[PDB]
Each structure stands twice: as structure tokens, then as C-alpha cells.
Amino acid sequence: ITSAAGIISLLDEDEPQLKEFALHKLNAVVNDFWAEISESVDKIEVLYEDEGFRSRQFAALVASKVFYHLGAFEESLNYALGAGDLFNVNDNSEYVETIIAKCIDHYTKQCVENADLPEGEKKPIDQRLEGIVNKMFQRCLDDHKYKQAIGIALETRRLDVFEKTILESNDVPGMLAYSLKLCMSLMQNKQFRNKVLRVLVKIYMNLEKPDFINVCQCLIFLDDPQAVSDILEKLVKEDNLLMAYQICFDLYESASQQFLSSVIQNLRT
Amino acid sequence: AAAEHSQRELDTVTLEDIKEHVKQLEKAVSGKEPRFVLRALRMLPSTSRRLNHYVLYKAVQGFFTSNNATRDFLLPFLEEPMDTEADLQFRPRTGKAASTPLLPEVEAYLQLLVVIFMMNSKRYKEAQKISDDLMQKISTQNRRALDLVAAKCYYYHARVYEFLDKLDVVRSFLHARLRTATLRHDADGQATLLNLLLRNYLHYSLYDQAEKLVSKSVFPEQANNNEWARYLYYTGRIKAIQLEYSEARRTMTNALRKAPQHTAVGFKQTVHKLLIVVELLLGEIPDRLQFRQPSLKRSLMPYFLLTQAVRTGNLAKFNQVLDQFGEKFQADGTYTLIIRLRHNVIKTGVRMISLSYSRISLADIAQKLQLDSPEDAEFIVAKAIRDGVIEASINHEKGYVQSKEMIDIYSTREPQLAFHQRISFCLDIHNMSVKAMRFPPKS
Amino acid sequence: ATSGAVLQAATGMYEQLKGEWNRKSPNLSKCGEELGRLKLVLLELNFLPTTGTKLTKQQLILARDILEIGAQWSILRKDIPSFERYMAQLKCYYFDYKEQLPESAYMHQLLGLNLLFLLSQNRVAEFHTELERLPAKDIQTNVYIKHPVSLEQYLMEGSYNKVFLAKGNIPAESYTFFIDILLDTIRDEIAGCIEKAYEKILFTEATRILFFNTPKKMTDYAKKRGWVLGPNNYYSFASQQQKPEDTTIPSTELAKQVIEYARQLEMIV
Amino acid sequence: DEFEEFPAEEDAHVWEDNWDDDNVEDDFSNQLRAELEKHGY
Amino acid sequence: RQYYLSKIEELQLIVNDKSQNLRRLQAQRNE
Amino acid sequence: VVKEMLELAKNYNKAVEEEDKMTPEQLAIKNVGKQDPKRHLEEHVDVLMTSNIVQCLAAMLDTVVFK
Amino acid sequence: YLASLIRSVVALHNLINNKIANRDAEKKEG
Amino acid sequence: DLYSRYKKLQQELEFLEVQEEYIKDEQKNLKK
């Protein structure tokens, strides 16, 4: 029937083995009786707080589930993060979905702050928190369409996964155009914009036949006159010519006179 | 038969009502306002009845009919009409509309109507399979509007299980399904689920388990009047058992005030049943206008003989009533509370003495309350004084229970505080009225 | 097979503990060690429904009887924390498995105490909610349940003189230890009455009021509670009632409440 | 919105009736007759 | 993909009430 | 002012409780003379409520500042 | 308080009048 | 389109906030 919550009496006991059967059982019945275990808290909390318990990493899960049921999400991730493996990795249940959502929701807040103060003052990021997000990042990569994880990729900075996503199978370099457009239009930090652009150019260069049209267009916003100058020279020395002309004819129709005056100057050398 | 011909006219009108609901249901989905659905869902109880097998079939043959497995699920679960002469093809979805999968709102609404019909047809399992699939459909469905239509189905689904008379199989389901809403900031669904859940809890007398759930959970303040009325009764039932009497009256009287004027003869019947017993245990003689009212006249007459007993204080009369009408109380779920009273009849008379007398000598209190000895009253006189049923001080130096010298309140700060709670609500009403004001996006 | 072997062991430990218990002197220390082990095998056997298998009906009785052993073991030692941990643990068996497991007469018994325990700690709120679980007929018919509820009824109604005399109606000594606790509780409860009802009191009268056979015992509450003894040997509780808060205009609080009206009538919303 | 969940479970006297009316006591003249006689003697 | 879509589906409710609000404030103004 | 607003409520009851529906949009425009419905209504409420709130707040501030 | 109540009843009356206004225009659009 | 919808919505919310702030000011200034 399971119409009682005296198990919390077990967790009141002292036999370390007996706690484990109680702690396990609650996590098998926490989804229903979240009430009583909410008052327990400290009882389950102290079990994880204590470093000697045999199954502490199970204590947090049950305790985390109780808090998730109760609704104090600010503390649900804390205990969820402390646990591991069984903690949330299962990536199957609704409680996982709500904890992961915040956890990847919590992650971006830290990373956005971090990119503001990267001069060593940057606040630390927990490996488990990064572990879960990148695991998700590793999850979003290998699950299905990557034109989504890219958005979550640049959502929480993490340029490495950004490069990985587009450089990965990526079906076609068409998703590169999708990302590029998003970088220009729906990016509100120039310092990030520059960093996104560097990734977009670097992917452009490593391509077998790099998209000169986009790369020069990408560079203009990045404000790289010399870099475009060297690109122009190699294209000439490779006997491309035909594609080189539009890159110049598209260049004059966007850039500034200072940009051109500098870019022209490089060629003369 | 002309009765069914009006019925199909009722069907078509219900279909038109449904089409009105579906068109409004499809209106809200693209209308960007979940409010529209509430109108269709309030007509739901009205349209809940007035439907037989031809209704849904033509509706499901009128709606859906996308060749989707949906037809294959509820069509077999409801009797299909013959080749009726008036084959009014009521297809609000024409071709592409049929091709387009039914929005999660209308499908559940149509399925709920089948579910309702399932209830109306006592087919709680076909509805069970219908409904859980409905849930199995709407469990994944994460729209914002479906939460409303889901909420109505939930209670019906709780109601289909309600007629299934298990209530534990859905104890967990409704217990978890609740948590899905709260993690969505959804308003109505959380409200409806909680009330059904609590009803589950009291139905087996797990008041301890129930008392917790209300302790941590927070009922959405901006909730349906219908629901707000329900939650207040269940909390009142819990509070009364938990010996928090004074709060039991405040919520139950407030729960009663929220009853849907004159639709629910029953709910008003049960609440008054607890209110009368709840009030007695607190030392207040309940209102007489209750026991004369038409709907509650015979229903509360069993409690009537009780309240007369308490005021009379004739314990022999009080026991006599429990012996006869007592057994009926159990079904009402009140016998236990009455048992508390039997050894608490002395309190009111202690209040009656404190309300009229102001310096009654203890020996006199014993005479007027039937207490055996002047010494016995002292514990009872103090206890009533101790428990805040009186406002008196027992000066044991000479055995007189002095009552508190009442003051001119208007010169103290009580009236200002009473005006503050009043003005805050009055101003809030203005903000709530002004805040919505629902100026339609100027067409 | 193994469950039966443990069942045989559990019964063996039972027949040991039972024999250790059924003996007129069930040594708490000797019994205590035996009881713990049975739980572990029960921890393997079960303490909740858990698996869908039909748990050994004897096994359910054994754990119940082993706890039933413990509960009456718990009363033996007089350890309140033990009684709670055992009772709440024992609480489950009474309600969860009602449909299949039969009801050994001790079930009413251990229920009979449990209500008394709740009263002893003054948790009268948990008392009535506790009564609700028991069926209607058992409330008046069962002697074990009747004594507390009737004890509760006098306590509510202020027949403390009845409670003191009624103390001799305890059918099983297990009630006796708690009932002594209630004797302290009621004397405290009576003490509560002597506070906010009477402004003054007479030690000779108060000695009667608190049912204290020793003036030094009165010194106890004169020490523990420290009821300020009046100048004429009349414990002066008049210092308790007092009459504050009728002289100072809150001023600061009202200017805050009035401002809130002002803001609500000027906010643009 | 009838609450079908909660089942909806001679003395046609118009006048509103107060609690004290139900009180059972001998007629007033008999009280005064006793009261006057008792103090009368 | 589920969290990324649930998040958009709650910010959609908030903007929806804001839009209904902005219409009203425009109405309170023009009067 | 409370006396004057009272008489203005009497009309507000009569003006609303009339609620005559013979083209009510035209009723709301054939009875416009700066009269009962609202203009002589809460217009006074603002005056009445502003005067009291300011007076009260002044009263409590003085009670705190001056001893 | 009396000032507050008047401003509230007027507020509700203005929403009811408005709820009728947009609703009536809502039906009248058809 | 999971990301695409996200940025347009959040941009709309941020921009509708500005409309609210301006309108809240202009109502106040008009009252003057």
C-alpha cells in the first residue's frame, strides 16, 4: 500500500548499512512522499555532509529529489551537482529534466559573468557543473540536429563546443551559414562577436575551397585589414583571379575608406 | 424519435457548441490568450450532459477523421449510430484542417467529452485507456493552453478513477502529475490537481499525510473560485482534526462563502455539516437560519438535534442523539469530531457564563454549569480562561472570575488595523481590475 | 529458500529472541543485540512492499513480531527515542499491509500505547490525527485504546482530579512508564493553568493546585519554572499578565502603512 | 459546475425562529405565579 | 531538445501578458 | 466632501442602475455634462484621499520627530 | 476606506463595462 | 528552429520592456 513514511525512522538509526536500505528506499518512494522527507532534510543532508557514509552519493540524490519536489531549485542543483553517476546521468526521468534544465540554465549565468572578467579574477566553475553541461554538450552533439546545440553552444559561451559542432559531421557547411547569420544578427556582445568570428573564419580557412565571399565579409566586421590583405595576395598567387575580383568588388561595397586604404596599402607591399 | 432529433439538434448545437469550443479552442491557440478556453471549459459541465452515442461519433466523425489512430481509439469505445437520415457532416476541419493533427486542446476536449461520455457511459476503463492515453497524449504535450484542458480532464480522470473507486492508483499519479504543473508555473492545473489529490487523502483518513501536503504546497492565489472553495473545505477538514479549531471555522465559513451561489446543493450540505460541529467544539452556538434552509433542512436536521443538545447542555440528551443519529455521522465523516464534543460540552456553558456574568463567584459557576464541586470548576473555569474561550481572570484570593474591563476601541488602534486590511484589499481590487482591463489589441 | 532459511533464522533469532523475550525476564541488553540482527535479515527480507513478491506472511509477522518484540522491548528499556524509532518503523506494518497480513491482537495493543505516547509528549495534535487511523468501533471497545482516549477526554475537559485517580486503570505496565511522564506533563499542563488564570496564589493552596506532596518539589517548579514567589508566600504570577502596548503610538509603523496607500494610488500601473 | 464529486445527499412555517424559542420551560404566568407566591408569602 | 523548447514556451507566456499590458498602457495614455 | 460625494453616489446608483440599453453608447454621449458617473465621482475620491493621506502622514511624522 | 471602496467599485464597473465592450465588439465582428 | 525562436522571443521581451518604461513615463509626464 505504502501509506506511511516511517522510513525516516530508519535514517534516524546508526547502523550504516541500515541507512543505505532506508536511503535507497526513500529514493524509490521520494517521488510520492516528498512531504515527510522535506522535514527530514538535515537527516539526509547530514548523511551527505558526513564524509564517512558508505553511500553518500546516494544520500544527495534522495535529498536532491526531496528538494526538487519541495521546489527549492536553488538548493536542488547544489545537491544534484554534489552527487555523481546515478546523480543525474540517467538523463531519463522528469526530475532529471528539471535538474538538468536548471543546471544548464545555471551554467550560462556563471559563464556570462566569467567572460566579463577573464583577467584571472574570473570566478571558478565546478567541474561537475561543467561536466554535466559538456556531457549535455556531448549529449546535444551526438543526439540529433546540431543546429540546436550550436544555439545552446553560443548560449553559454563555450567556443570549443561551438567549433566542435560546426566542424563535426554537421551534415553540410550550410549550418555554417546559419551560425554566421545568428552571430551577426542576434549577438549583442562585440567581444564575443569577435571571438565567434574568429571561429567562423578559422573554419573558413580549413575548408577545402574556403568560402572567400563569406570570409572577407566575416572579416570586415572582425576588423582585420591585414588578414584580408594576405588572403588577397595568396588568391592572386594561386591564379584564382575570378573569385579574387568579387572579394574585392564585394569588399569596396561594405568596408570603410580607412579599412580599404589600409588593405590597399598591404597589397602594394 | 423527435427526442433524438432534438438530441442531434442538441448534438449539432453541442457540436456547434463544441465547434464554438473548438473554434474558440483553435481561437486561443492562435489567439494568444488562454482565457478563451475557460469559457469553453465552463460550458463543459453544461455540455457535459446532453449527449448520447451518436453525438461523439458524428463529432469524432466530424472532428478528427484525419484517418488518425485517434478515431480508432474512441470510436470503438462508443456505440456508433446507424445510417441516420440527418447525416449532417459536422466537420470544422475540412481537408487540410483534417490533415493537420488536432491541436492538443481540442483532441483532449473531444477525448474528454468521450471521457465525459465514458463517465456518462460509465466506461471509466475505456476512458481509462482513453484518458491515460489522453494523459499519455497530454503527458508529453507541453503547450500552455492544454494545461487548462488537461486540468479539467484530470479531475474527470480522477473522477473516472473516482468512480473506479481505487483512488490509490491515482494517488501517486495525481501526486506526481501535480509536480509537472508546479515546475511550469501553471495556474489552473496545479489548483485542480491538488483538490483531487486531497480528496484522495481524506478518503482514506491519512490526515497526517494530508496535513503535510498543505504545509509545504502553496495554493495559487489567482485560482478559480470553484477550486478556491474546494481547497478551503479540505484544509478546513484537516485543520479541524488537527485541533486547530479557530482556524477551521475561519476557513470553512470562507469556504462556504465561495460556494457557487446555487449549483452545488451537496458541497454546501457537507460544509455546513462540519461548520455546525466545528463551531460547537469551539464554544459557539451556530446560526439558526442554517437549519431552516431548504437544501440543508433535512440534510443538517441530524446535526440540529445536536446543537440543541449543546445549548441545553443535557448530556443525557447529547448521548441519546449520538446513539440514534450518531451512526449517520460516520458516513459524513464526523462521528470522531462529535466524540470530542461529548467531553467538551462544558466549555460553551463556561462561555455563556463569561459572556453574561462579569464577576461570578466560582461556587455560582458550579451551580449554573452542573459541575460537581466548586473545586472542579476552578480547573474548568481557568481552563476556559486559559484556552482563550473567555477573557477573564480568576482571583483565587476570594474565588471570583472577573471579566476583563472592556475599553473604548475607537480610541485604541484596533479600528485602524481593521481599516488597513480593508483598504489594502480595496486598493488591490482596483489594481486587479485595472491591471487586467483586457483592452483587446486594437483591431 | 534463502528467505525461509533467514525466516528459519529470523524465527531462529525469533525463537532465540522470542525465547529471550517470551521468558519472564526478556533482558533488554540480551534482547537488544538479537533484535538488531533480525532487522538486517529483514533489511534483506523486507521492511516495505518493495518487490511485488508475496512477502512471507510469517516474515511480515516476524518483523512485526520482532518489532512487536521491540515495541514492548522499547517500553521495557524506557528509552523514548527507541520507542519513536521502533514505533514509527512499526507504524508502517499496521496500515500498509492491512489487506493481506492478518491482525495479531498485539496490533491493537501497540496501537493502544501509541496514542498514550503522543499524549505523554503533549503532542495532542498528533494524538487525534492518530485516532483517525483506527476504525470507529475500536475507539470505544478496545481497552488499550480506550484508556488514553478516555484519559485524553478528561484532560481536555479539565478533570485533572479524575486523571490522577484514573491512573490506576492502566491494564498493562507498559502504560505505567509513559503515564508517569503524563503525570509530569499534566502537572505542567495544570501549571499552565495556574499561570494566566490566577494573578496570585497560596502556597498551601498552590501546593494543592499543583498536586505537590513536597514544598521542595514546589521549589522545583520554583527553580525549573521559577514561578516568582510572592512576598506573602503567594507565588506572584501577577507579573505574568501585565498590561503593555496601550501607551505608545507606533508612529513609524503607520507612516509606513499610509505611505503604502500613497504609493498604490500613485503607481503608474 | 455542480459538485457531483460530493454527493448531493410538515414544518412549512414561514417565520424565522431564534434559538431561545426552542427552550423548554413552563409558561410565564406559572413562573410569575410561583415567583409572586414565593415572595408573596 | 526538450529543455530548450520548454524554456521558450514559458518566456512566451510572459511576453504575451506584456503585450496585452502594453496595449492597455497605450490606451490609458491616448485618452 | 463626504456629504457631497454621497449625493453623487445616489446619482451613480440611478445612473448605473438605469443602465438603459436604448443604444447605450449613445446614452453615454447624450448625458455628458460633466456629471455623476465618474467625473464628479472619484475626482472627489482623489481629493478626499489625498487630503487625508497627507494629513495622516504629517501627523505620524510629527509624532516621531517631535518627542 | 470609503474613498478606497468607491474607487474600487468604480474600477470593477469599468472592467465590466469594458469586458462587455470588447466582447460585444467581439461578437459583432462576425 | 529551437534556438531561432528563442532569441526573437527574448529580444521581444527585452524590447517590450522599453515600451512599458517609456509609456509609464509619458503617462506620468502627461499628468503634469
Side-chain angles (χ1 to χ4, degrees), chain B residues 124-164:
Chain B
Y124 317 123
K125 322 214 64 177
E126 318 183 8
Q128 210 162 341
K129 325 308 168 183
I130 280 178
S131 56
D132 73 335
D133 190 23
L134 172 46
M135 326 282 165
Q136 281 156 347
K137 301 288 180 50
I138 74 94
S139 57
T140 60
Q141 305 279 11
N142 210 336
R143 304 217 33 175
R144 184 39 71 259
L146 154 80
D147 316 346
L148 294 292
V149 168
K152 200 55 182 178
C153 304
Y154 293 151
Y155 143 71
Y156 296 27
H157 181 88
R159 176 93 168 285
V160 311
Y161 278 81
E162 195 104 329
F163 293 117
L164 289 189

Side-chain angles (χ1 to χ4, degrees), chain B residues 162 166-172 174 195-206:
Chain B
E162 195 104 329
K166 330 251 286 179
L167 201 66
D168 315 51
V169 290
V170 287
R171 186 175 166 189
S172 187
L174 310 165
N195 285 350
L196 281 293
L197 199 53
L198 256 286
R199 184 191 179 94
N200 191 348
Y201 266 35
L202 263 52
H203 191 316
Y204 293 79
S205 90
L206 301 63

Side-chain angles (χ1 to χ4, degrees), chain F residues 25-54:
Chain F
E25 54 271 28
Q26 290 297 108
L27 204 42
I29 206 70
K30 76 170 60 62
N31 207 344
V32 287
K34 203 181 81 178
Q35 321 172 203
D36 152 35
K38 287 104 185 64
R39 295 148 301 295
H40 289 180
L41 226 330
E42 72 275 15
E43 174 166 352
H44 284 337
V45 167
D46 275 310
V47 162
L48 190 32
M49 186 189 308
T50 279
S51 188
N52 290 283
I53 283 286
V54 183

Side-chain angles (χ1 to χ4, degrees), chain C residues 118-165:
Chain C
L118 323 190
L119 218 76
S120 60
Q121 311 324 104
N122 203 353
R123 293 211 288 295
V124 86
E126 298 173 359
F127 180 105
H128 301 286
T129 165
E130 193 41 276
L131 263 186
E132 267 333 307
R133 291 313 284 298
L134 315 187
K137 151 281 171 184
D138 313 356
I139 314 304
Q140 324 87 22
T141 298
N142 182 217
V143 174
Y144 309 131
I145 310 148
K146 191 177 183 161
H147 184 283
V149 46
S150 302
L151 221 42
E152 182 295 337
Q153 290 162 154
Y154 306 149
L155 191 31
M156 202 38 270
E157 161 176 10
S159 303
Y160 311 144
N161 227 322
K162 198 65 49 71
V163 173
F164 282 67
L165 50 90

Side-chain angles (χ1 to χ4, degrees), chain C residues 17-137:
Chain C
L17 170 76
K18 210 173 188 176
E20 243 294 352
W21 191 47
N22 293 20
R23 140 187 165 186
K24 290 191 175 184
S25 57
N27 175 287
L28 276 153
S29 305
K30 298 181 175 178
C31 293
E33 313 143 0
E34 198 68 10
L35 274 161
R37 317 303 74 73
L38 285 161
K39 341 202 194 147
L40 314 169
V41 317
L42 290 165
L43 300 193
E44 290 88 53
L45 291 172
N46 226 1
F47 260 94
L48 324 190
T50 318
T51 310
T53 55
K54 300 167 180 177
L55 291 165
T56 298
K57 323 313 306 184
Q58 305 164 327
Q59 146 205 47
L60 273 287
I61 319 308
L62 309 177
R64 140 168 198 196
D65 297 9
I66 289 157
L67 279 171
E68 219 144 50
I69 273 186
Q72 293 174 13
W73 187 96
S74 306
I75 54 187
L76 282 195
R77 222 186 251 305
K78 307 177 176 183
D79 173 293
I80 296 85
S82 61
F83 191 73
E84 325 162 300
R85 49 209 46 171
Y86 282 109
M87 267 291 337
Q89 261 156 122
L90 171 43
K91 257 288 180 53
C92 304
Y93 291 87
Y94 285 141
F95 320 140
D96 172 17
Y97 259 119
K98 189 170 176 170
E99 317 74 46
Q100 307 83 359
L101 311 187
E103 319 162 332
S104 85
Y106 308 90
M107 96 78 78
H108 273 127
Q109 158 63 13
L110 296 153
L111 274 298
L113 316 81
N114 189 348
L115 286 279
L116 190 184
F117 171 29
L118 323 190
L119 218 76
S120 60
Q121 311 324 104
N122 203 353
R123 293 211 288 295
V124 86
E126 298 173 359
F127 180 105
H128 301 286
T129 165
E130 193 41 276
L131 263 186
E132 267 333 307
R133 291 313 284 298
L134 315 187
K137 151 281 171 184

Side-chain angles (χ1 to χ4, degrees), chain A residues 108-174:
Chain A
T108 165
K109 156 59 49 176
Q110 267 182 343
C111 217
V112 179
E113 307 337 323
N114 294 125
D116 302 349
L117 297 312
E119 62 275 34
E121 150 159 10
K122 193 204 307 302
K123 335 296 147 284
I125 301 164
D126 157 88
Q127 313 327 320
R128 312 160 310 216
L129 196 37
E130 182 293 337
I132 171 65
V133 171
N134 83 271
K135 136 79 156 152
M136 215 36 42
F137 267 131
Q138 188 48 93
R139 280 205 60 263
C140 49
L141 280 157
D142 75 321
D143 206 311
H144 211 333
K145 301 277 131 296
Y146 331 91
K147 77 196 331 303
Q148 153 184 329
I150 162 60
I152 308 314
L154 46 80
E155 186 195 2
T156 167
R157 334 320 290 191
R158 267 292 286 290
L159 330 170
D160 41 42
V161 50
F162 180 9
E163 217 198 43
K164 273 182 51 33
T165 49
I166 300 332
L167 278 70
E168 267 184 357
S169 40
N170 80 84
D171 321 300
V172 284

